[PDB]
Structure 1
Amino acid sequence: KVFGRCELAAAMKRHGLDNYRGYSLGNWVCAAKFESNFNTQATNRNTDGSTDYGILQINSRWWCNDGRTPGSRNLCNIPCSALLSSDITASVNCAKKIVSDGNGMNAWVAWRNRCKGTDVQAWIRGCRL
């Protein structure tokens, strides 16, 4: 599913991401824009041989199982394909663990490089939330 901007903002808010670990909703929408372009089916191979999955490009090296990432963990206890679903529940649950791991949203390099410190509230402008 390709979410609209406000559509994703509403789903993330319903699933408890607004202000999760102190990160406002716009931070999460911004991350998803630059990770996946709001496309739940997005997959991208990483240079280390792991793959990123879904709306927030969650990495098979630590977080989900894809069966082809040696020496990798599955800390969200989920097949990586479950992070591609139209329903974002598994991605959100997993993202909550990631953002709690010590470095906050810096876990998403694209968030650090493209969202961090910017006017992230712009990402929820006009949304009826």
Structure 2
Amino acid sequence: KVFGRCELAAAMKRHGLDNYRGYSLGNWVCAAKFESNFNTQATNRNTDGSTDYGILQINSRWWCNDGRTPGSRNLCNIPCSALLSSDITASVNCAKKIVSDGNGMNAWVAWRNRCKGTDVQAWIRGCRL
């Protein structure tokens, strides 16, 4: 599913991602925009042979099982395919763990390079939330 911007905002807020670990909703929406273009089915291979999945491009190196990342972990205890669903619950729950790992949203390189230090509230402006 490809979310609309305000649609994703509302879904993230309902799942309690807004202000989670101190990251306002616009941070999360901006991360999703640049990781996936709001597309839950997004997948991308990394150099190391791991793959990133879903709206927040969660990496199989650490966080989910895809059956093909030898030596990786599965710290969210889920198949990576769960992160591609139209329902973002699994992505949100796993993102909550990731953002709690010590580096905050710097875990998402696209957030660091495209969202951090910008007017992230722009990503939720206009939305009725």
Q: Calculate the TM-score normalised by the size of structure 2.
A: 1.00
Q: Deviations over 1:15-72 (max 9, x none)?
A: 0001000000000000000000000000000011000000000000000000000110
Unpaired runs of 5+ in structure 1? none
Structure 2 gap segments, 5+ residues each: none
Q: Quote the offset at 1:116 in angstroms.
A: 0.2
Structure 1: distance between partners of 2:92 and 2:8: 11
Displacement of 1:85 in angstroms is: 0.2
Tell me how far 1:101 sits from its aligned partner: 0.1
Q: Distance in 2 between matches of 1:73 and 1:104?
A: 19
Give the Cα–Cα distance (whole angstroms) in 2 for the partners of residues 110 and 70 of structure 1: 25
Percent of aligned pairs with the same amino acid: 100
| Cα distance in 1 between the residues matched to 2:94 and 2:21 | 13
Equivalent in the alignment of 1:4: 4
The aligned length equals 129
Provide the residue aligned with 1:99 in structure 2. 99
Q: SS in structure 1 opposite 2:38?
A: coil
CA RMSD of aligned residues (A): 0.2
